[PDB]
């Protein structure tokens, strides 16, 4: 089971978002195996 990092909601600024966005770009690709 792959694990979906944690979404930063309003209260984060958008370069963590960035992040998110690319951890989460990795985590549909081990999705995407699962």
């Given at each position: 089971?792959p694990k979906?990092?944690?979404?930063?909601?309003?209260?984060?600024?958008p370069?963590?978002?960035?992040?998110?966005?690319?951890?989460?770009?990795?985590?549909?690709?081990?999705?995407?195996?699962?």
């Amino acid at each position: 089971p792959p694990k979906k990092p944690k979404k930063p909601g309003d209260n984060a600024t958008p370069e963590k978002l960035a992040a998110y966005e690319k951890e989460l770009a990795a985590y549909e690709k081990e999705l995407a195996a699962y």
